[PDB]
Design a protein around this nucleic acid. Structure first.
Ligand SMILES: Nc1ccn([C@H]2C[C@H](O)[C@@H](COP(=O)(O)OP(=O)(O)OP(=O)(O)O)O2)c(=O)n1
Ligand SMILES: [Ca+2]
Ligand code: NA
Ligand code: NA
Length: 318
DNA sequence: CGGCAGTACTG
DNA sequence: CAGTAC
DNA sequence: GCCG
């Protein structure tokens, strides 16, 4: 493996990310992930400059670690970065909020609890700071999925409930659970949140609400009994016609999703959680021209329409 | 030069 | 709207 | 940061 250039680069990428330089961190993340899974430990520059996701600047960076075992840029990391990471790991606080709290003199979560002004969402995030940093065993995700299914199938036994994300990709542990709900009849999915969430609330299962939209719920749940932790839970209701694209999107991974949107763009197509469709119309779309929705009854058709072989969820774990 | 996704909340 | 998240 |  490459673990003597990546380890240095990953410290720079984190500092860029927590300081809000989202695009530079992207390029670092890609270039790093390239190094991770390369067959060979890289030897020198051409080898580098001739790599996908490694350009002149990164190439220069790559030889320093090769030539010197050190990269000078690592000596100019702001002392703020660890605190910014601490603050942005609060659900609901991002880089802008973290930088403002830092500028205001806050340095610890005790400072935040006692003096910061917090949104409803950030207060819930703070209250579950440790829990939301933990992963749950996939068997607990199954229990959470079944709790949603049981509550849903009580109002309409036709409803289909599927846990996506890292659960559907087969991982041993899961950061949170994303439950997708549809109905093959095409309509009965509409307006089920009021009853479903009221039902899950009457349990004591749902403990906090983060986002209560018309098709999307983001909140916090806890199963009964001792030794249970609070978990992040999303519930997304989609029409049956979008089910394939929604399953793909919410199964991820997020890096797999990014690669698929890029591949779709090469074919003049758009890929979202709602549809695979023909482009609107320079770059980043056009002003007029809605585009056509391509028929995607199953996940397999999205791959096919992109000219790609079907990948089971476990093989999307990029 | 400029995209690297578009949309959904929240306030 | 800006910020955050998916 | 990467890329076209
Ligand atoms: N920035 C993001 C965030 C999410 N997603 C999609 C793909 C993810 O798989 C899915 C669910 O979001 P999560 O953050 O829960 O993704 P995972 O379940 O894969 O995260 P984890 O590895 O912790 O399990 O939404 C995306 O495309 N882009
Ligand atoms: Ca998840
Ligand atoms: Na956060
Ligand atoms: Na999630």
């Amino acid at each position: 493996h490459n673990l003597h250039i990546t380890e240095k680069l990953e410290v720079l990428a984190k500092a860029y990310s927590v300081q809000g330089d989202k695009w530079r961190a992207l390029g670092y993340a890609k270039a790093i992930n390239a190094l991770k899974s390369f067959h060979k430990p890289v030897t020198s520059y051409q080898e580098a400059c001739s790599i996908p996701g490694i350009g002149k600047r990164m190439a220069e960076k790559i030889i320093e670690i090769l030539e010197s075992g050190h990269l000078r840029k690592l000596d100019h990391i702001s002392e703020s970065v660890p605190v910014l990471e601490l603050f942005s790991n609060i659900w609901g606080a991002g880089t802008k909020t973290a930088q403002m709290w830092y500028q205001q003199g806050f340095r610890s979560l005790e400072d935040i609890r006692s003096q910061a002004s917090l949104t409803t969402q950030q207060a819930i995030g703070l209250k579950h700071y440790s829990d939301f940093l933990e992963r749950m065993p996939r068997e607990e995700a199954t229990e959470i999925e079944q709790t949603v299914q049981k509550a849903a199938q009580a109002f309409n036994s036709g409803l289909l409930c599927v846990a996506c994300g890292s659960y559907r990709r087969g991982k041993a542990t899961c950061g949170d659970v994303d439950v997708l709900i549809t109905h093959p009849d095409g309509r009965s999915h509409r307006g089920i949140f009021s009853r479903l969430l009221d039902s899950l609330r009457q349990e004591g299962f749902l403990t906090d609400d983060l986002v209560k939209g018309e098709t999307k719920y983001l909140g916090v749940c806890r199963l009964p009994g001792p030794g249970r932790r609070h978990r992040r839970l999303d519930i997304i209701v989609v029409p049956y016609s979008e089910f394939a694209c929604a399953l793909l999107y919410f199964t991820g991974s997020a890096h797999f999703n990014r690669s698929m949107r890029a591949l779709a763009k090469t074919k003049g197509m758009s890929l979202s959680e709602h549809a695979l469709s023909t482009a609107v119309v320079n770059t980043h779309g056009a002003k007029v021209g809605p585009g056509r929705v391509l028929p995607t009854p199953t996940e397999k058709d999205v791959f096919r329409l992109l000219g790609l072989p079907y990948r089971e969820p476990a093989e999307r774990d990029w």
